[PDB]
Design an enzyme around this catalytic site. Sequence first.
Site, PDB file in Angstrom:
ATOM      1  CB  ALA A 166      -0.944  -0.045   1.202  1.00  0.00           C
ATOM      2  CG  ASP A 167       3.732   1.755  -2.562  1.00  0.00           C
ATOM      3  OD1 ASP A 167       3.835   1.012  -1.575  1.00  0.00           O
ATOM      4  OD2 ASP A 167       4.421   1.619  -3.644  1.00  0.00           O
ATOM      5  CB  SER A 168       1.203   7.662  -0.101  1.00  0.00           C
ATOM      6  OG  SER A 168       0.656   7.853   1.201  1.00  0.00           O
TER       7      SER A 168
END
Length: 77
Positions: free
Chosen positions: A34-36
Amino acid sequence: STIEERVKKIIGQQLGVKQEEVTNNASFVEDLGADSLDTVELVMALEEEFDTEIPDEEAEKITTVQAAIDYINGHQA
């Protein structure tokens, strides 16, 4: 270049993964940790797609990839 087609592509541009790494029912927090830029790229990708600007609430339940195909599929119906 079906729905899911372009979708995957875009998603593949949001971060920079392949197809086997972004499987239809691919994950994010477990896949791309989960990458911004991912959650953000989803707000832009969808925005640049059908100007839908995906929020962070609906993005949660749409963290996966296939979720970005079922929601986009709405384009047809």
